[PDB]
Amino acid sequence: LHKEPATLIKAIDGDTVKLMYKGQPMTFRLLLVDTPETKHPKKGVEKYGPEASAFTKKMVENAKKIEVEFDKGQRTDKYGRGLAYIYADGKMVNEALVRQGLAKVAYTHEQHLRKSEAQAKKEKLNIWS
Template identity: 40%
Template sequence: MKQKNANFYRQILQYIRTNPRNSILIVLLIIFGYFGINDLEDTSVQNNQTEISTPVAFDGSNYNVLPKEQKIPAEFVSARDGDTIVVSVNGHEINVRYLIIDTPEMNYDTGNPDPYAEEALEANLDYLTQADQIYLEFDVGPFTDNYNRALAYVYADDIFVNEALVADGLATVRYLNPPNVSKEPELRKAESQAQKKQINIWK
């Protein structure tokens, strides 16, 4: 850069010698060019020295570092029932409760699952195990419930699993706790369609 500046100024001085009437204008241009070029150089150096800040890594409990209303990659681990799963995020396993939906209970303590509970679990497993990538999406409200379960919308590739289970007639729209209700309209629509078709729990 310095060599290029030197050549530039030599050309300017040569021009002044041959065009003395324009010398004042040329001097002003030189002053402006000198400071302008140096300012650009300083800015370039500063930009190169600027460190890009990165968010704190998720450690399994500090949910506040995770973004809201964005898909977060996760690894499927297991499913307890149709609306509760375990996933791994950043290498940490967390329990996830599907937002705004409720599936029939498996009732592991009694060994008597509610009607369609097993079908809901099976459908949930099918969506999650057949996908190449699982995603969680947090709403605008609290990250977790009173049981410290992550409250999220779950995606299997491009399939919105919460909605798919409702559309399959294996889940109902329930447990709405504002402001975590952004997806309520589409879930209500899926529920209405399942009711009209009278499928599974709506028979």
């Protein structure tokens, strides 16, 4: 999580955007957020999808400065879309979507994992010794 400038090529849908990142075009996918579909080849457009797209679309279009929190490993999804936290003038796009009920936080095992970490810290195990 180190911000880096990017510029908008074009907004694609609720959770994907095409940006110029490092002098090269790149389609980014919003980390940890799943918005309803609009352009998905398997199940079409879902309820609130259009509204989700419009939100993301205008958020990155009205923005003067766009930045991305894209890991040094440049992780991508199965379609080659780079995952990141996108900020429209410092406001996080993934959170803004989630807060308006236009995206759902994706299911991960983090909550469970930190539960364990706290316990290992308590017991002051190895790293936490």
